[PDB]
From a paper:
The direct connection between adjacent cells is made by end-to-end docking of two hemichannels (termed connexons) from each cell, each consisting of six protomers, thereby forming a dodecameric gap junction channel (GJC). Here, we determine cryo-electron microscopy structures of Cx36 GJC at 2.2–3.6 Å resolutions, revealing a dynamic equilibrium between its closed and open states.
Wild-type Cx36 (Cx36-WT) proteins were solubilized in lauryl maltose neopentyl glycol (LMNG) and cholesterol hemisuccinate (CHS) and purified as dodecameric GJCs. Thus, we performed cryo-EM experiments of Cx36-WT in LMNG/CHS (Cx36LMNG-WT) and Cx36-BRIL in soybean lipid nanodiscs (Cx36Nano-BRIL) and obtained 3.2 Å and 3.4 Å consensus maps, respectively. Next, we conducted protomer-focused 3D classification to understand the structural equilibrium in each GJC sample and found that Cx36LMNG-WT and Cx36Nano-BRIL GJCs showed the FN/PLN ratios of 71:29 and 12:88, respectively. While Cx36-WT and Cx36-BRIL in soybean lipids were mainly in the PLN conformation, those in detergents were mainly or completely in the FN conformation, suggesting that detergents contributed to the PLN-to-FN transition more than lipids.
Author numbering:
A (entry chain E), B (entry chain F), C (entry chain A), D (entry chain B), E (entry chain D), F (entry chain C), ...: 19 to 100, 196 to 278
The structure:
């Protein structure tokens, strides 16, 4: 039962990479061009879009995917150049995945609303703005959260079998 | 007769992958840019498009194609690492393909109409909107439904020869 | 004389694949963006374009190219897994190529006109619309018809040498 | 002296392929979007552009490049499957290259002018239209004519050494 | 401890290359199209954008990435063709990386502001302009500065072990 | 000292190829779309852009890069088919590189100005036009001139060691 | 007390004439030009304005003012040409003034609302339209109703003193 | 009874003059500016308006009012300069008023419709146009017809008392 | 001293009439056409203008001028038809002028501001609007208040000489 | 019979004055604002309108009306200041009226066409322009020609009775 | 010599009245509609026009013309109702004319410039605005100043003949 | 012969007054609104119109008409209040009419051209502008010059009969 778990970790990792690389590049393609606010002021659109979406979802996910694969590359390069490395890389992977999951929760939450109200200069008082494609982005958010949670659960499993404290 | 059936399963799977990857990427390319509603309200176009098409067809199909190939990858990785796996992966493939076919039917139906009437905020009362390229999308829908049905029929065939109950 | 015919079948097939893949992707690129009608009604452009061009030429040709190569793939996979197959695949290829040629003739004809008059809702009475790049598309149509005819002639040749009735 | 000539034929062929594939795809990219006529009539722009440029230069050149390489592929496939073929393929190459050069001269001439005057329906009387990037296209025309002429000269050389009449 | 340092240099170099190649190409894509100034003068937008951003960040980083890999290529080619080379290439790498880091600091600083005021001809007096996506670009700046600093620290480490003065 | 010079020639050639292929394709992307003149005449923009930039910089550089590599390909093909060739190809490389450098100097100079005044038909008298991104293009010009000069210097070095007169 | 009543009738009549002639001509001046509906359909504005305001207030009032002065002119012309006439003209004046007051009440009511919703062809479903200057027009309505009521009361007074039944 | 009839003729004539001069000048003021057709063709609006309304109602009525007062002016001037004149001027007035009433009926009818469909050059096929203020104009038409009929009836009365045949 | 006061009353009355009739008709001419709000909503301009200026200044002043002259007309008509009337008309004039002055103060105040913020449907939240010609209108307000005050003072003077209580 | 002719001259003169003064001022009001040509050139509209209508009809008619009344004013002033004058003024009136009628015929003809084609600088080649209200203007032309002809006939009558040669 | 001076005062007064009433009403007609500023901000045009021209020239002149005629009206009314009045009215006329001339000089100066630079909210920093018809307005200013000066000189003349101190 | 000359002076004066007052007010009505220049600069239109037409023709003519009637008014007022005056007023009239005629010639010339080229700030270099209605204005110029010349000739006639030197 604990033997097959490794296979599921490898399969989930590859599945996540494929989903992000093949489909995610094109939901966000028109994110700023189809964002519109009810106003006549030059420059209000730029400021309000920047305030609503500081970092796009797909950039965060690509960065996370690349960064969680670094301990494996280090371990592989070590063996090519030539037990402690295994434990250390497991600890580092655990830390990286919990940090990234909590950061995801704190940055974005669990939904993308359809309306946004912004009151940043050069806008006059508060104005109302409207988002493009909220439902698809919410579904993507929830799916990615679930898959990353599965991965977090899986990595903790192996730690306790080898680890003691 | 039951021997050749496996060859037809492999050929249909590859055919589906090729059709989705080569042609589908470009029928949907202008889906939102050429969607137009009869109105003068900012933000009505975004809301009504989001209500008419929550998830685009091609995203659902790519996800389905990737997800129905996971039991094979798991079985292959197992053998590389090193009879029960065959039966279990057959059961899982059957379940995944029936679930995806029923979900397709419940989400989209069998046609894409040319007109859509929307009454979502910020629109005033009900408004009329107009869709781009309905006939091509309807043809694609019907073809994909037929091919997936063929695959469903084929997978059930092998289950009953080996299975008992 | 009948020996070299096979070489010409292989060369024509590859030539057709290359022409469709390399050049055809870009004549049709702006098909809908540069289609214009003389009217002030929202939504008339979409309906009239959909009525004039239900399925784009290049989509039909890509589908045909992929579908006429399936019996060969089936025969090849059979030998990898391990005389009747040869005859059957020849019959199937013949049927597929005659069906596709007749369907091409019935769907599109032999020319693309420069003007089109449309009377579909929401348009008021009949309106006049104007097509982009008719001459290039007509030339492409005629060339593809000629090449497919050559292939049809070639496939019938081998059938009668081996076949009897 | 006649020995090295073959090397120059191979080098010129590869040079032509590289120049057409790498640079030509992007001079013509905006050919129709930046073509403009002095008029207020819908549909006059489409008709006048179609009359000025029936077939784009780059499509003709790609077709020519692919078609002049067919006798070599036939000869190569023959040897793989298994003196007369050499002579026949030389004759065919000669014919194809003279035909394509004369056709180029008759279709396009030696320059692309900056102004064009068109009197096709739906335009009222004659109107004046203006072309984008004439100088670059003229230079490309002249260079391609020179290279193709060199190739024509080279192919005739070998014919007379082996040929008699 | 000094042994593993080389592995971290190789991993950081590859990580930097991947981050620049995969994600950076698309934050800057719309840099000039969504830059807008409050004015009615033709040509003021071009001049003010040119004054605000003389060289785009991504061009500088790509150039730096390519240029810091030249001593390694020279050393590798030398061995293929066939101790002093090692020391010299280390000195050159050190010099190149300190020069590039200082140049980065002097050209761009540590942030990208949201507003810019420009007074260049043909603009009348001073005008106000507005930048697109400042926060994402600031984050990218800071991350790249940190990674390059790590690399600078690492390269100095090996110099002092072998070097004396 | 003269031995290592060959390595530097190979490294500079590869460096130039990489810089042109990876970065240059995108500075010039919007060259004509963001070129604007102060006028109300149709067709003045096209004529004045054509007069200011007859051949784009990147097309000239790609052509030069491809053309300066032909003697090497000829020499390589000769050896594959099977001392005088070495001397002749050196002479030809020298001639090609001096000709291309002088042509660069005579066509473009050393800078790209921000303003251009044009008086070509259909423009009325003289008009003023405005260029996009002058500083980046000037920097690229200067860098390419320097690298090509280095290559010219290097090729002359080897000529005089083997050559006499 | 009944003697002075005649003076008040003459003063009220002149007051009404002055108010209508001097001020009313300019509140209604922009009635249709500043009427706007939320729609993109040609011709919807005309139909909805016609349905909201069939006869403008000021035209009705001018007609009424002119028509209620006809019995006096007839009586005056009779005397110029040369007791029964007095009674008859009093009866006719009474009838005309009650008819006009009731018609005013039935046509317009007591207020002008700021919003109007119209569903007349060529409009799609129901649309919302917006009125200009509602408060001033409501005040004018109420004032005119009050003055006309005073006149009605005054004319009945004299009838009963001379009349019996 | 026949004595008072003359007074009613004078009163009706003055009433008609006042109504036409005071109110009619401003219903028709915006007749052409607010006439709109669904089309993109220059010059279609002018032609279709000219075809729908060849002579405006108010011009016809002013001309009629002036022309029916000429016999009186002639008779008056005759007496100033100094029984047969009375009879002749009565005959002429009768003829003029019947001719003008019949001409009114034949030119305009009894209503002004809200829609008009026009198929005059330069319009393409038939187009639909929309009229401004139809109800007010219909009411004016009917009122003027009634008043002119009353006048016709009155003039015939006096003719038969003096006339015999 | 009290004798000349009557002359000053007559002169001030005529002066006020002249100023209102000759100059006031044209300061307010463009009141609504040059009123503008920062918004993209149809119908917000109408509602906010109606809320800012319910009754225009010039309409109120014309009404006041006409209404304060009615007791004089009544007294004059009485004498034409044929001491108590003098006292009563003085009381009525006093009452009318105090009522109109207080009403002016309560409706408009003492200034017209340049900015106005409105939050009436269909506007979204609060919006900012901008007034035309505030200074001229403020000056007119103050001048009219001063003149009317002078008239009020003058009318009270005569009341106390004849009146007792 | 010749006695009454003078009365008809006076009546026709007054009738003409009234028709020109009351109705003609408003058919021509929008003559240039609703004149439109199919072109994109600034300044073509002005030149083509000036070429089509050098002097407006109504200006010519007003000038004629004023100028044909000068001999009467001279004769009247002479008598006020204090047989030959009568004859001379008759001769002058005859001459003025024949000259003005012939000039009318030579300047304008008998109709106003709906289309006009103009080829004046700055227009490119020939362009097509469209006239407003042709039918009403044609009717006015014909009526004025008829009335002026009647006047010409009448003035000749009196000349021959008094004149001899 | 002092006798004729009165005639010149009466003639100058009437001349001034005629010039102001007949010509001045139409130079200023388009004062605000053709005033334009180089900016994209709503509401900047209104504020800057209000700051440049607080009170229009023609309003000031009409007010002055009416106000300088009040002592004459008072004196005339006095005589109608029925030596000290003559002296007092002369003193008052003198005072009014010097005050109005000095006020004119302090408000407007001696010229109207063609450019104006404004820095009032809501404008961003300083902006440049452009005036319509400066030369005609400057000429009018100078002429009115000269005529008013002549009148001032004339009124002082009579004061010193009758006055002592 | 010299007796009748006075009558012709009175008739010409009245004729000129009538022509200027009745027709001239409406040729110049749209002088600035239909003036257009080929440019994109704000404020160039105002400056170039001001430079082309400093004082409009009709303003100069009205001023001249009023000013040449002042000596008559002075002489008339003198006689009302109560030989030298006659001579002096004749001298003054002569001087005024020669001065005004020469000033007309020096200001305007004899024609109004259709094109005007202007190079005033804020325009860039020289630009081309286009005038409205040149032919009608030229005809008016010539007619007014002729009439004023006739008047000049007439006034000199009487001077020499009474005058000596």
């Amino acid at each position: 039962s604990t033997m097959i778990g490794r296979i599921l970790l490898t399969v989930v990792v590859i599945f996540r990479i494929l989903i992000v690389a093949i489909v995610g590049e094109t939901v966000y393609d028109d994110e700023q061009t189809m964002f519109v606010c009810n106003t006549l002021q030059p420059g209000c659109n730029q400021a309000c879009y920047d305030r609503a979406f500081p970092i796009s979802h797909i950039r965060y996910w690509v960065f996370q995917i690349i960064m969680v694969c670094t301990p494996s590359l280090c371990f592989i390069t070590y063996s090519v150049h030539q037990s402690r490395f295994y434990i250390i890389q497991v600890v580092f992977r655990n830390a990286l995945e919990i940090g990234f999951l909590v950061g995801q929760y704190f940055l974005y939450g669990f939904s993308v609303p359809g309306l946004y109200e912004c009151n940043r200069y050069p806008c006059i008082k508060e104005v109302e703005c409207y988002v493009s494609r909220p439902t698809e982005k919410t579904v993507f958010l929830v799916f990615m959260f679930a898959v990353s949670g599965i991965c977090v659960v899986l990595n903790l499993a192996e730690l306790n079998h080898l680890g003691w404290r």
